[PDB]
Design a protein around this ligand. Structure first.
Ligand SMILES: Nc1ncnc2c1ncn2[C@@H]1O[C@H](COP(=O)(O)OP(=O)(O)O)[C@@H](O)[C@H]1O
Ligand SMILES: [Mg+2]
Ligand SMILES: [Mg+2]
Ligand SMILES: [Mg+2]
Length: 421
């Protein structure tokens, strides 16, 4: 079988990495992919907005299974297109991807279907939003409805902070139609973790959970990021905690989507907040998370390709997970999240430490080496029998392949490790 992974970041590398270990697969294509990915996936110069060249390529090159990595193509219906071409593909329809694409939709669905989440309202009028902020007071969370790039959530500690954001979103339309509408919801606290699951209709197959550092600098201070590293398992969250969110959140969400003419096949991502009231939904994503995938896929014992195939056909799925833990650290470019440097030489990026994989997020091959090719560059990930073992090993390799121009956090998984004792 030929498999087509789509996307260009660290998640897609892990996908190409895992698919390549599969015994069913003759060829793995990544489109576009990136240059660190090349031992795993024959790259393909079709960009991922290129739904037509992707469909055309896959149709003509006998792709038996396409996996779609990023959410925009899904939100914009790349899946529907492949199915029109008769192509076998893993991911949600444009109708299903709405569960991530419109946060209003997901807030409303959870409400309608009694799924635990922050209390909220959604606004299209700035005046009415502001009056609601002034009624509820701060803390309060201001969320753009549509994608907005990850940089469209503001946790406001003051009403002035909230009203400012409502001004950017609604009066200035910072994010266009993405911010044409706004979710305002209650501030929740606690441990945040990712619960991803393989979903098709009402069938849910949970994956092991992960946790990431969304914040730029150590001690979790600084602007937000797209992930500065993560790890799995999450020791300080019980096994019953997870089994419970699967039954009261994830399966109900899957079933809810079916019963709204929006049946969901793909990866459903529940980012969850374990509050003093129990687990609550911060948000759904409609695909593998980044960088959650880099620490979650390697722990899967099963063949992913076999797994997806049994899911798409409607057969018994045999999903087995490894006991080993994995921990991953992001090497980011100086300036990130804000304006960052492109072109920095960072060497071979290939550690000597064993039981390590560097998944490339932003990198180009140039000069026999790698240049920085993005805000977040690499995902030094390591595996081991227990958390802190793997945690110690990552930073070993972190300290091997590190080159000037990159930074990172030294405290990944540290707070979890402590609070786990
Ligand atoms: N209600 C909330 N209470 C506390 N923190 C929140 C809330 N909503 C979001 N956050 C924080 O903001 C981040 C981004 O919000 P999220 O809803 O997950 O949207 P995005 O798709 O942009 O990631 C989260 O990962 C979490 O750390
Ligand atoms: Mg998130
Ligand atoms: Mg999201
Ligand atoms: Mg079989």
């Amino acid at each position: 079988m030929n498999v087509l992974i789509i996307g260009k970041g660290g998640r897609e590398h892990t996908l190409a990495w895992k698919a390549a270990q599969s015994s069913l697969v003759e060829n793995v294509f990544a489109a576009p992919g990136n240059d660190g990915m090349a031992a795993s996936a024959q790259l393909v110069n079709i960009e991922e907005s290129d739904h037509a060249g992707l469909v055309s390529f896959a149709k003509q090159n006998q792709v038996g299974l396409t996996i779609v990595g990023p959410e925009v193509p899904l939100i914009e219906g790349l899946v529907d297109e492949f199915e029109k071409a008769g192509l076998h593909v893993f991911g949600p329809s444009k109708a299903a991807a709405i569960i991530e694409g419109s946060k209003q939709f997901a807030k409303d669905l959870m409400k309608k279907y009694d799924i635990p989440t922050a209390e909220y309202e959604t606004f299209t009028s700035f005046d009415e939003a502001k009056a609601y902020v002034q009624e509820k007071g701060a803390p309060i969370v201001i969320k753009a409805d549509g994608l907005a790039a990850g940089k469209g959530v503001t946790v406001a500690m003051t009403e002035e902070e909230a009203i400012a954001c409502l001004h950017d979103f609604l009066e200035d339309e910072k994010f266009g139609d993405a911010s044409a509408s706004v979710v305002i919801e209650e501030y929740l606290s606690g441990e945040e973790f990712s619960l991803m699951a393989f979903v098709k209709g009402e069938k849910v197959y949970p994956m092991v959970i992960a946790q990431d550092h969304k914040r730029a600098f150590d001690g979790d201070k600084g602007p937000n990021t797209g992930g500065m590293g993560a790890y799995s398992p999450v020791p300080q969250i019980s096994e019953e905690t997870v089994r419970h969110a699967v039954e009261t959140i994830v399966k109900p969400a899957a079933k809810a989507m079916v019963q709204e003419g929006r049946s969901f096949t793909g990866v459903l991502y529940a980012g969850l907040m374990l509050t003093e009231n129990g687990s609550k939904v911060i948000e759904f994503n409609a695909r593998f998370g980044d960088p959650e995938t880099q620490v979650v896929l390697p722990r899967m014992e099963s063949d992913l390709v076999q797994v997806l195939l049994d899911l798409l056909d409607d057969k018994e799925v045999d999903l087995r997970w490894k006991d080993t833990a994995a921990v991953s650290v992001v090497l980011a470019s100086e300036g990130y999240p804000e304006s960052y440097a492109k072109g920095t030489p960072i060497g071979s990026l290939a550690a000597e430490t064993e039981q390590v994989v560097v998944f490339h997020a932003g990198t180009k091959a140039e000069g026999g080496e790698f240049v920085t090719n993005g805000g977040r560059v690499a995902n030094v990930t390591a595996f081991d029998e227990t958390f802190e073992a793997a945690r110690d090993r990552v930073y070993k390799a972190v300290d091997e392949i590190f080159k000037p121009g990159l930074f990172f956090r030294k405290d990944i998984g540290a707070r979890a490790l402590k609070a786990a004792q």
